[PDB]
């Protein structure tokens, strides 16, 4: 058993490779050149993933939810993660139950961010996702709470990707999975499940 987290550009996107794709999020307006993805693969299958888009290219903050956050100043340089995906049922079956695939992808996100020159990451999450990010210990920053609907609250967040954040999620995954300490410091990531 082994867990691989690494990134691929849209530009890069045999049997197992289509199994992965057959398990991926069906595209949208923001899936094109420039867009990168982090894929979590265990025994030839997609267990989790997340998408990264440049802040200056069209994205969910600048377009989809324009009316919601047009009052927030956005840096010229940056990345927005989205389509945070985790298949809990498949992770359990491959990485055993109680495995923190969620905390791992967060770690993969910080590590990928450092490897690509991003101090932090901008994202739009749902109330629930916010609850999880909060519980993860990751020192996220709500830039603005907005109302999608009458009761639907969504948030614009900055996810810290400094060394402290990396070590913090790393140490978390360690004492949690008991995996080798150096295994959470690299990019790409590779975890013994």
UniProtKB/Swiss-Prot annotation:
Catalysed conversion reaction: a fatty acyl-[ACP] + S-adenosyl-L-methionine = an N-acyl-L-homoserine lactone + S-methyl-5'-thioadenosine + holo-[ACP] + H(+)
Pfam family, one: Autoind_synth
Keyword presence, Nuclease: no
UniProt entry keywords in alphabetical sequence: Autoinducer synthesis, Quorum sensing, S-adenosyl-L-methionine, Transferase, Virulence
Xref: PROSITE patterns: AUTOINDUCER_SYNTH_1 (PS00949), AUTOINDUCER_SYNTH_2 (PS51187)
GO MF entry, a single one: N-acyl homoserine lactone synthase activity
InterPro entries for this protein: Acyl_CoA_acyltransferase, Autoind_synth_CS, Autoind_synthase
Similarity-based family: Belongs to the autoinducer synthase family.
Role of this protein: Required for the synthesis of OHHL (N-(3-oxohexanoyl)-L-homoserine lactone), an autoinducer molecule which binds to EsaR. OHHL is necessary for biosynthesis of EPS virulence factor (extracellular heteropolysaccharide) which plays a role in the development of Stewart's wilt on sweet corn.
Name by which UniProt lists this protein: Acyl-homoserine-lactone synthase
Upper classification of the organism: Bacteria, Pseudomonadati, Pseudomonadota, Gammaproteobacteria, Enterobacterales
Gene: esaI
């Amino acid at each position: 058993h082994m867990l691989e987290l690494f990134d691929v550009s849209y530009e890069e996107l045999r049997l197992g490779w289509e199994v992965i794709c057959s398990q991926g999020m069906e595209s949208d307006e923001f899936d094109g050149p420039g867009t990168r993805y982090i894929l979590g693969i265990c025994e030839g299958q997609l267990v989790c993933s997340v998408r990264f888009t440049s802040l200056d290219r069209p994205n969910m903050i600048t377009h989809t939810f324009q009316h919601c956050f047009s009052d927030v100043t956005l840096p010229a340089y940056g990345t927005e993660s989205s389509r945070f995906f985790v298949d809990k049922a498949r992770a359990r079956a491959l990485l055993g139950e109680h495995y923190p695939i969620s905390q791992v992808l967060f770690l993969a996100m910080v590590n990928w961010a450092q490897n690509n020159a991003y101090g932090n990451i901008y994202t739009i999450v749902s109330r629930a996702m916010l609850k999880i990010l909060t519980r993860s210990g990751w020192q996220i920053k709500v830039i603005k709470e907005a109302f999608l609907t009458e009761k639907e609250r969504i948030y614009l967040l900055t996810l810290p990707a400094g060394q402290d954040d990396k070590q913090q999620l790393g140490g978390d995954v360690v004492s949690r999975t008991g995996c080798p300490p150096v295994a959470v410091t690299t990019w790409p990531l590779t975890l013994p499940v």
